Amino acid sequence: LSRFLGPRYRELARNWIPTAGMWGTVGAVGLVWATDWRLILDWVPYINGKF
Amino acid sequence: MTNMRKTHPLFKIINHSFIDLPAPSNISSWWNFGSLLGVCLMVQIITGLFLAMHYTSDTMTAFSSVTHICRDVNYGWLIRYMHANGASMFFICLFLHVGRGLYYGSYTFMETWNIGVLLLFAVMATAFMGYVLPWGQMSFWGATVITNLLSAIPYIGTTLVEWIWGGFSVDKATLTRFFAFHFILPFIIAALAIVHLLFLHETGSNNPTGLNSDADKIPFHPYYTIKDILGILIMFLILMTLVLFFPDMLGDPDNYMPANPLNTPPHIKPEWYFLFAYAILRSIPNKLGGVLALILSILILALMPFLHTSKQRSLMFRPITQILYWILVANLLILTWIGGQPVEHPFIIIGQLASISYFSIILILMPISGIIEDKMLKLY
Amino acid sequence: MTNMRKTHPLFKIINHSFIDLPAPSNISSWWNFGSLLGVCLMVQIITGLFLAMHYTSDTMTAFSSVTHICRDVNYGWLIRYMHANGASMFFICLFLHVGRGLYYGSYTFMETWNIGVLLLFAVMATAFMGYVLPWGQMSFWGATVITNLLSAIPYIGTTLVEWIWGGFSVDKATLTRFFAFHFILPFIIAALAIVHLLFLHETGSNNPTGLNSDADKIPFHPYYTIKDILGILIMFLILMTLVLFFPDMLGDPDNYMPANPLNTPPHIKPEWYFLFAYAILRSIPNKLGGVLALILSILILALMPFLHTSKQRSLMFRPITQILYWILVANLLILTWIGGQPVEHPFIIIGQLASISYFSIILILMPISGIIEDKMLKLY
Amino acid sequence: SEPEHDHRKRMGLKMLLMMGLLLPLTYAMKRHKWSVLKSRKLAYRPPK
Amino acid sequence: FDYLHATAFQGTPLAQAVEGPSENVRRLSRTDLTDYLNRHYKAPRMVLAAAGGVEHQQLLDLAQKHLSSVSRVYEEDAVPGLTPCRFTGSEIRHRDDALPLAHVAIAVEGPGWANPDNVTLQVANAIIGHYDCTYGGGVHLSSPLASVAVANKLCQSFQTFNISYSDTGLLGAHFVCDAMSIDDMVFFLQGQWMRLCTSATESEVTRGKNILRNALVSHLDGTTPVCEDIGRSLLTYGRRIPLAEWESRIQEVDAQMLRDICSKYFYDQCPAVAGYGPIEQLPDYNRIRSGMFWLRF
Amino acid sequence: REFGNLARIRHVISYSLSPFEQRAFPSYFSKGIPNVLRRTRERILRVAPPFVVVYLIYTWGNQEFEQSKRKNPAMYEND
Amino acid sequence: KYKPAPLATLPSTLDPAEYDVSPETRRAQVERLSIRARLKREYLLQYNDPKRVSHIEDPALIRWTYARSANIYPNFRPTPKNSLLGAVAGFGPLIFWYYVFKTDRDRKERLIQEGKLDRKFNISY
Amino acid sequence: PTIPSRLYSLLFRRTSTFALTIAVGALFFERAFDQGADAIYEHINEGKLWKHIKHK
Amino acid sequence: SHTDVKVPDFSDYRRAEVLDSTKSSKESSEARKGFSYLVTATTTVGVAYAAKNVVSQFVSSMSASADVLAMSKIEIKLSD
Ligand code: HEM
Ligand code: HEM
Numbered sequence A: 001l002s003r004f005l006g007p008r009y010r011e012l013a014r015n016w017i018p019t020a021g022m023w024g025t026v027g028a029v030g031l032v033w034a035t036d037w038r039l040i041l042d043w044v045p046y047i048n049g050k051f
Numbered sequence B, C: 001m002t003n004m005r006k007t008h009p010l011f012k013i014i015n016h017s018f019i020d021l022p023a024p025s026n027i028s029s030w031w032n033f034g035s036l037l038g039v040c041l042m043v044q045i046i047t048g049l050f051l052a053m054h055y056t057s058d059t060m061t062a063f064s065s066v067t068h069i070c071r072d073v074n075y076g077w078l079i080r081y082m083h084a085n086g087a088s089m090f091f092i093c094l095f096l097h098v099g100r101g102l103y104y105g106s107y108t109f110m111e112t113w114n115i116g117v118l119l120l121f122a123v124m125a126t127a128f129m130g131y132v133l134p135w136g137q138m139s140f141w142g143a144t145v146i147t148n149l150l151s152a153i154p155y156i157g158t159t160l161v162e163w164i165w166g167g168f169s170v171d172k173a174t175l176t177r178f179f180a181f182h183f184i185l186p187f188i189i190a191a192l193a194i195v196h197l198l199f200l201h202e203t204g205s206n207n208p209t210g211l212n213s214d215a216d217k218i219p220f221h222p223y224y225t226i227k228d229i230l231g232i233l234i235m236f237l238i239l240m241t242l243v244l245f246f247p248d249m250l251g252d253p254d255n256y257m258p259a260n261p262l263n264t265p266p267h268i269k270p271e272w273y274f275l276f277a278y279a280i281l282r283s284i285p286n287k288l289g290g291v292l293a294l295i296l297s298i299l300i301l302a303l304m305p306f307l308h309t310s311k312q313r314s315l316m317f318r319p320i321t322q323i324l325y326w327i328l329v330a331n332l333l334i335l336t337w338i339g340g341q342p343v344e345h346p347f348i349i350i351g352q353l354a355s356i357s358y359f360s361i362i363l364i365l366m367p368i369s370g371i372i373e374d375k376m377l378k379l380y
Numbered sequence D: 001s002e003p004e005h006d007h008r009k010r011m012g013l014k015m016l017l018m019m020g021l022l023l024p025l026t027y028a029m030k031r032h033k034w035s036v037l038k039s040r041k042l043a044y045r046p047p048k
Numbered sequence E: 001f002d003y004l005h006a007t008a009f010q011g012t013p014l015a016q017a018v019e020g021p022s023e024n025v026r027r028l029s030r031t032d033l034t035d036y037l038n039r040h041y042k043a044p045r046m047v048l049a050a051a052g053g054v055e056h057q058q059l060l061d062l063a064q065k066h067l068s069s070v071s072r073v074y075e076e077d078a079v080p081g082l083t084p085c086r087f088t089g090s091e092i093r094h095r096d097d098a099l100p101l102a103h104v105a106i107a108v109e110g111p112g113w114a115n116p117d118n119v120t121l122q123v124a125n126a127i128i129g130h131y132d133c134t135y136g137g138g139v140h141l142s143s144p145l146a147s148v149a150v151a152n153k154l155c156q157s158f159q160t161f162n163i164s165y166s167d168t169g170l171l172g173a174h175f176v177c178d179a180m181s182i183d184d185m186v187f188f189l190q191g192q193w194m195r196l197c198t199s200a201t202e203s204e205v206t207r208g209k210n211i212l213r214n215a216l217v218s219h220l221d222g223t224t225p226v227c228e229d230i231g232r233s234l235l236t237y238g239r240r241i242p243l244a245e246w247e248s249r250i251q252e253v254d255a256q257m258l259r260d261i262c263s264k265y266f267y268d269q270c271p272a273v274a275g276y277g278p279i280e281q282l283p284d285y286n287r288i289r290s291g292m293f294w295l296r297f
Numbered sequence F: 001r002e003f004g005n006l007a008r009i010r011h012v013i014s015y016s017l018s019p020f021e022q023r024a025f026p027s028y029f030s031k032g033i034p035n036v037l038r039r040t041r042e043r044i045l046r047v048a049p050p051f052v053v054v055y056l057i058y059t060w061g062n063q064e065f066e067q068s069k070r071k072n073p074a075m076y077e078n079d
Numbered sequence G: 001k002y003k004p005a006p007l008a009t010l011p012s013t014l015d016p017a018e019y020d021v022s023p024e025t026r027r028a029q030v031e032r033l034s035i036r037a038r039l040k041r042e043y044l045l046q047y048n049d050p051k052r053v054s055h056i057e058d059p060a061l062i063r064w065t066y067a068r069s070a071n072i073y074p075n076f077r078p079t080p081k082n083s084l085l086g087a088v089a090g091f092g093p094l095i096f097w098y099y100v101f102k103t104d105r106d107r108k109e110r111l112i113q114e115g116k117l118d119r120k121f122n123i124s125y
Numbered sequence H: 001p002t003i004p005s006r007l008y009s010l011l012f013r014r015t016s017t018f019a020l021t022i023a024v025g026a027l028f029f030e031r032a033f034d035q036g037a038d039a040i041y042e043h044i045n046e047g048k049l050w051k052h053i054k055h056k
Numbered sequence I: 001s002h003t004d005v006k007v008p009d010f011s012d013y014r015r016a017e018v019l020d021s022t023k024s025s026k027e028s029s030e031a032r033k034g035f036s037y038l039v040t041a042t043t044t045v046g047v048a049y050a051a052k053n054v055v056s057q058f059v060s061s062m063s064a065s066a067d068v069l070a071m072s073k074i075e076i077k078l079s080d
């Protein structure tokens, strides 16, 4: 924590922001695709009709 | 020409784990409880083997199959009451094992402790999930109350509770679900205990004094297998005193009616190892806060690797951390009594104050107690 | 920083087992059947785990619970017919693994083979204990015939018959006891598979050439993991074509009648993997000799490490022993065909000549073929 | 006997089309990972 | 290095050694050597480097007197021509298990001389650095591959190289290791390479830029290696780049710039692998490729 | 039993190439079917006449069951 | 650049092998000019001989005619690839157009014998 | 650059882009494959199923 | 010695964009990687279908039965 807070670790965290955020969207889109949420799948126009 | 216990590979891992494992010589009777949990899990598995051979799982004749076991099956009463009081023996050995783990500085065996609390979650789940299976009024309404308190979460709660029910209430699919789960879960508990022993045997065992025990080592055989046999004989003394003299004392007498959904018991109460869990769930007035206090109460002793602020390992040389540990187990006993008591003014304020004080001991006061130990012994 | 796969002990077990295992680069599609047996045993455990959530074991409503699985619960027909056709796939992969072990001369892994023979005993035990569980005519009378075969043992055999029966006939206690045994025995098979891997991993793995091949060794990952994935997908193609297109041609049609002791089927057979077992036990008119020939015909694979007389390990460079091995495979197919019909002319003669040929190929003919092979290829 | 029968043939056709669209691709993945051993050429260089 | 040049550029003119094989030494007569002298020793492919102590007008008068009219026009107007050589990612492994120390090199094709990014691939190569077992830095050495190697006793030496040719280079690491830690050295080398390639820091690249500035001025200190730099720079770069322009190319390099052009020249690329010694605990080439590209990013 | 201490092999080299730089199917449909026919020719003389005799004894058994189920026209036809 | 093709080939002026040539390649070009000079001088001597009244017997054209006519079966070797591809190219479309002709004529004979197909004005069949 | 080269350079070289391509193609494969499989199933029996006899 | 080692002719195995020695492999490197990872991703979408759909069948089988869904609807109290 105290050894993990610093300028170099903040720059490494800034370097690891977009791929971990994209992995978070991977987990969110995979959770949506696994559970088939009715609020979210009714907004995509390819699955717009009834499924 | 060659040694069989270091040549033959099953005998090599049996010899390394059981025969000349480097173990500290100064461990007390409280270190016997892990092997007591192993042999108690084995006697729960073998009594469940000889119990499920005459058990029929459906709500028309589950209780009739239980009474057929207790009356018409030869020596079936011994198997069923030995299984129930061996679940009680399993949980008092588990509670003394986790009290030893909170006491003697073994938070720091981190992967051992994390797969231990995964094992403890699975043991509590299979204990409730096998307590449904006699199909009494108390078992059915305890199943309804414990699964209905999982429905407090919005947007996933009613999907989760019709998923775990198989209907609008507890029924035939719920009982066969819980019997299949109660078969499958203690074998993955036993495999988790095997890899828990592997994560222990990576770094050996520890002493009551919190020191590096590498200077003084004895073999596990025959120095600890005869202490294992003595612990097994005193555990079988208390377990056989529980089955052959007081069979329904630790159990609930209200379970021994046929199950009826048209009426309710005058107070609803789960088992004695779930009483502190039910008191912590009853302490929070919000129901989602109660189930979050349930999950955080079981999971908060896994944060004890991260709550080691003291430079001394064990609590043997920590005198007021010992005071906070015995007031923690006093809060656990008061929680067990409060969960045994029904929901009345003023048991609720006693349960609220004792749950707040128990979370203050396990979260706040014991790290600052370790800080004031290392301040009073001039470490910094 | 440190290497996690060679530092973490739970990762060290999977690194020594499935990631950085020294495996030969030679090995064919026949060597994929061990991982296919493990994966299909895991899907049989998962499939029966999700099949026992609605199954009720009693003498009245077992067939009603099986048809409640088949048509009433959501998509339980796929799980039930997947369990039946995956028991068929379990025995397909087990018979081809046993044929691979005879095919490529891996009798020299003696304790590995003996642990495998104890797996074959336990797999045949849980398959017989699981075929009774849809309580039908074929299941009832097949369990009646196979558990009535154990009365041929003198002076203790009928006491063993009423011991495993739990009463005067096959009944409610026999069905719930076989349910308990059928649930518990694949975990014994899984622990025996773990010690099968443990006895394998020090002696190494065979190759089709049949040599000590430690010069040419590749890691298990990603080569044999991707060959495992390809074998899993072709095994699942044969398995899903077995469940979703041809679901009841391996299964007997008389299982789908409700069970009744008043009416017997005219032809009594088990499912297809026990047909060579029934061909062994129908050949001798002395039933104690049939039981002894059955236990000898399964245990003769365990005695097969003491019939390795040739100086070449694999059978691939032994063409006379290849002739005797493929006539052994065709004779086992003759046994599998002849086990399903009633004792008529000339089927008793065909089964008797097939049983004495099945013993004579293993006992005398293949060691004297190894001796003739060595004397023809100048090893004397 | 079979109320699942049309759903069984529908899920079997879904399995057959997904495995026709899957199995040569994972066979190509196996052959792609095994091309190193399938073109591993050897030589002997003795010290004479 | 000769095995790596044989297995990295197979089927090309860069596969062969500088010395030539023993079946080709024995047939070299005088007329083939004077054909080679008449073809490849031509005057505008030749520079005259002097370094200090000279005067350039004196050298040009002496080159007018002596080294003028060597040879300019070819025989049958048959010009030699440079070709873009194919880099083939491959594996050669000479297994000698009685030999004591395993020398294993792993190299990716780098951009070469005339491409301007030899400074940024060299500053990545100098962040990775070098170690030999006689270095007394110990565990406290700055390069983390060398720190891990002396922490858990992996290898005797490792040297990270940027050998460049015209449009084709080998940049990689060659390590002298034992028979029991080639898997550890390969895993920690690819982990340090792609920890550099994913999470490059400003302190790491200013350490590398400082060690490159010191390495270039320590190389171009002496008269004989500064004449080596004058001749190599005049044959390859066309002009000779002064060190002020090398400093201006070094000072524009940052960690973001290093991260993307490392993603150009490092990430998911098939390397060439050579090994002489006990090469049993080298991983196979699919494990080299699975240990290249990262499970997280 | 790990890598490195398996066996001593000296003076061997092993050329290789990347998975990416070669075709995933190097001459499959032509020049793999001669290899399949050569392996089939190599092992079908030791596989096949057991399978020829299992089809022969299958045909003998089914024909003998079909003949023995049907009654004879010789005995008890003239009483 | 300009990508090559088997049907749209690389020209020799854009070819990379014309720009990196060797003295053995130049000696090969000199020997190709020498053999073209020998064949051109022999052809031109036979062209401008006035004693010649017949045509020019072209030996390479006689060689090409003999190779395309009466060398193929003396230079046959039966290979499995040639046997399988010749069996496919000599048998395959006969079974294919057999299936086309028999399917169309079974359809036509079935529709005539059932009466669905009508020959309204079909006098010359 | 050719046809697979740009999609390798922008959505296949990073493992997060690889998994996002896998998940987005998984959702599109779910809807398109279920539509195509039910279309070829109702083409292999139009009038036998409960759809197209539901007029009663 | 070491200089007599040459890698042999890999023309029967290598791809047609790598088969010429006058071209570099970095031009077609993205093409071969985007073909083989397309093969890998088109396998993995079917593997994700087989791991989603079978898990959904097992989860819906762990859910409530159709007989329980038929019996859970109450009797209609109607107009009177
Ligand atoms: C119920 C099944 C359990 C079994 C069979 C089991 C088994 C064992 C065994 C055999 C030992 C070594 C003691 C000896 O042989 O002398 C041990 C120690 C240990 N166990 Fe467990 N254990 C169980 C539950 C748990 C749980 C739930 C935890 C987590 C709180 C845990 C944490 C530990 C720790 C930290 C030690 C090392 C300190 C000590 O030896 O007392 N165990 N266990
Ligand atoms: C895999 C091994 C096990 C099997 C096969 C098994 C099987 C059974 C069966 C058939 C019953 C119902 C009969 C009855 O009413 O007592 C039952 C009840 C029960 N089991 Fe288990 N069990 C196993 C392990 C355990 C374990 C490890 C525990 C402790 C956590 C446990 C706790 C209980 C409890 C509390 C009951 C209810 C006792 C009662 O009220 O009658 N079981 N078990």
Ligand code: HEM
Binding pocket: C030, C031, C032, C033, C034, C035, C037, C038, C041, C094, C097, C098, C100, C101, C104, C106, C107, C109, C112, C113, C116, C117, C119, C120, C123, C189, C193, C196, C197, C200, C205, C206, C301
């Ligand atoms: C219970 C089901 C079984 C499982 C899960 C199983 C599992 C495995 C596995 C994972 C392997 C290593 C992969 C390989 O090298 O093929 C293996 C190999 C082996 N198994 Fe089994 N096995 C089973 C049944 C048997 C039986 C019944 C035998 C005895 C005939 C046997 C004997 C062997 C032998 C001798 C080998 C090593 C040589 C070889 O693979 O050709 N296994 N088994």
Ligand code: HEM
Binding pocket: C041, C044, C045, C046, C047, C048, C049, C051, C052, C055, C066, C080, C083, C084, C086, C087, C090, C123, C126, C127, C130, C131, C132, C133, C134, C182, C183, C184, C185, C186, C187, C251, C255
């Ligand atoms: C521990 C995991 C297993 C459990 C809980 C289990 C449970 C069951 C249950 C409840 C049934 C009756 C339902 C039905 O299919 O009609 C059954 C049937 C059956 N099981 Fe298992 N089983 C398991 C593993 C296996 C294995 C490994 C085999 C293969 C040896 C097997 C072979 C069979 C067979 C042949 C049937 C009868 C199939 C039929 O005709 O319906 N089971 N099992």
